[PDB]
Amino acid sequence: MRECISIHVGQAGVQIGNACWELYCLEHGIQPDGQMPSDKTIGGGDDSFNTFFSETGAGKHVPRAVFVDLEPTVIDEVRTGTYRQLFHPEQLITGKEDAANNYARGHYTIGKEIIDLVLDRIRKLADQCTGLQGFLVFHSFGGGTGSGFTSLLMERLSVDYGKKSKLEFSIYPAPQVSTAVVEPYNSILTTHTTLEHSDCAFMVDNEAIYDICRRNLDIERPTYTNLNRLISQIVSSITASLRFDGALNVDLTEFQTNLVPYPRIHFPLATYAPVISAEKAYHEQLSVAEITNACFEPANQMVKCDPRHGKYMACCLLYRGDVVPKDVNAAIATIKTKRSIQFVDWCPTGFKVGINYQPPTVVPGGDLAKVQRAVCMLSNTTAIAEAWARLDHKFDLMYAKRAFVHWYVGEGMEEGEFSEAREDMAALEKDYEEVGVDS
């Protein structure tokens, strides 16, 4: 058994973290007090769920998780809420004042003052590990902390833990729920500095999640709570292979080997189905062929983009519930003749499939109906570059006038970093174009 440490940075990172861990607890039969009746081994074990949870003598199952934020209010909710007992205080780390939606402020100014404490708290968890695989890092692109402190933390993790793999779960900014005009800046700045430190990054566009909650859950005006419960289902389905017995994506490294041939192009597109409203009194239970076809609908993707006008490098289908290999193969075969699926010529045209018999767990009183089968597709396609194009453009518009730049320079960041970062993104966009486009 090899351990995984989760790290949640800033409000978005922390709130998603809470949703995930609540779900992990329900999936593994763990109560908010940390007690787990199902676990016959007391105070120890090397089961698959021990990759995410450690154990004490009292039979308490503690998340291998660290929560970090530059102001106390979001993590205070963890310290006082339902799962207050779950975490020990030293995991829950807060500063006094936030990064004010300013990358430079979270990376340079405040980051320098708290980075060593955070790393030493992480070392505390790491020294409890017999074979640490690495880290799962949750954060926003748009926030001062999510962007600024995360990129600093990633850099120092590559130093303190050079061998370990690092995976990201990143929230991409959407104006419908965004809180800052400078979010495109923070997104490009953090992506530039983090690129070489992240092995595989799962990008989630708030716009996509928002619209999925509107159209499929019948939620008029989605809150973060609505978004995060959906997000934590997708995260759970991605990490399930590390937490349960199986043979696909069983270690962090395998995510890179299966999904990421080119180190820079490490942003797999996630697509999930079905998302069914808990309010419906008559659920038409979807079949394997149906939920698998849904994986090729832009409407179900974590980032809205068009995979038809890009090339696939890899594809993984992760099923939960009543699903047999025969029905997946029948589904894949039908879909191949009705969908535009073009792989790069230096890669096999195929799918790695994983099935977990337990149907998705839902939160009681949540917006999600329980279903008999669900699937999350992970496909490294060049089409996700559309999200970079959109981001880069907004950056270009503001930067041309140097709007808001003084806020960053005033924190001690040099103006050159802006252009160094935009260049990296220009190259990144060029890399996708070489891979995905033919003329």
Binding site: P325, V328, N329, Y357, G410, E411
Partner: protein
């Protein structure tokens, strides 16, 4: 439609279906950048305080 590497356990199964074959900065560097930014802040504040003293 060739199915490769079927693995089954009590929790589930996994396999691969192939449709068609193919055709970092050191600690010191980080401290250096952080300190350079700190010094620029220091310089900027110093210039402000100089202005105010005038």
């Amino acid at each position: 439609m060739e199915v490769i590497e079927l693995n089954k356990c009590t929790s589930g199964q996994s396999f691969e279906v192939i449709l068609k074959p193919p055709s970092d900065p050191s600690l010191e560097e980080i401290q250096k950048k952080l300190e350079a930014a700190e010094e620029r802040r220091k310089y900027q504040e110093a210039e402000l305080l100089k202005h105010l003293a005038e």
